[PDB]
């Protein structure tokens, strides 16, 4: 039963994530929705990194530095860390699986925290200026 | 009501796709499941191109040529064209939306058709050897 948001929907909205954790012996369901909410927030950041990968690859890209896929995966933490105002928009438990999904939605992000995290992982000033500027496009595009 | 496959599930299987088309004035639902099945197959190929993007970006990448995101998007057609044995595994119509989803699953792909399509879009021999070899990894990984 329900909810619409749990349907494969496949058009982006990059700042929204769904992801799940599973019921587990040690644990209250409140702990398991937390795990799921947290993985869903991480999914938003993964969505953002994927978009940045597309930008860097683009014929248009201005970033001069070499950024490897492993470096991009590395950007996931600081993007996450930079997320502001992420609301849990809904929880769904699959009764067959005991699998708990979460819909999360990031309202914005802290550019200066992101700039700082990116500099700590050995990006150029040029690269962070561009990366942070792409994330800003991402958030205004909602 | 049902089906499991229509749940946000989020772990890959790269050779499976879900996508949808919508009911439309001109048209029998058989035409609209066809549209959906066809977009789902295209989704498999999009899934494959995304994986190739990750490989090329990797510190490990052997491909010497410059491949732009626009070029990668260009690889989508020949990958699709190369897909063999794609079964429609299920159809689901959202009654609220009149939205028809399709689950499709590509059993394999024709390496020589892929090699040919890739050469036609101005890839090196080196690039196609590597790209085709990554797709082979993708299909064996199922």
From TrEMBL, chains A, B:
- What protein name does the entry list? Tumor necrosis factor alpha-inducing protein
Name the lineage: Bacteria, Pseudomonadati, Campylobacterota, Epsilonproteobacteria, Campylobacterales
Origin species:
Helicobacter pylori (strain ATCC 700392 / 26695) (Campylobacter pylori)
């Amino acid at each position: 039963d329900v909810p619409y948001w749990m349907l494969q929907n496949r058009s982006e909205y990059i700042t929204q994530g769904v992801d799940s954790s599973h019921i587990v012996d040690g644990k209250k369901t409140e702990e398991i929705e937390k795990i799921a909410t947290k993985r869903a927030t991480i999914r938003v950041a993964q969505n953002i990194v994927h978009k940045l990968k597309e930008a860097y690859l683009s014929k248009t890209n201005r970033i001069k530095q070499k950024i490897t896929n492993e470096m991009f995966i590395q950007m996931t933490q600081p993007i996450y860390d930079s997320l502001m105002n992420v609301d849990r928009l809904g929880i769904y438990i699959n009764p067959n699986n005991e699998e708990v999904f979460a819909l999360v939605r990031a309202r914005g992000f802290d550019k200066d925290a992101l700039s700082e995290g990116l500099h700590k992982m050995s990006l150029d000033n040029q690269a962070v200026s561009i990366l942070v500027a792409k994330v800003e496009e991402i958030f205004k595009d909602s």
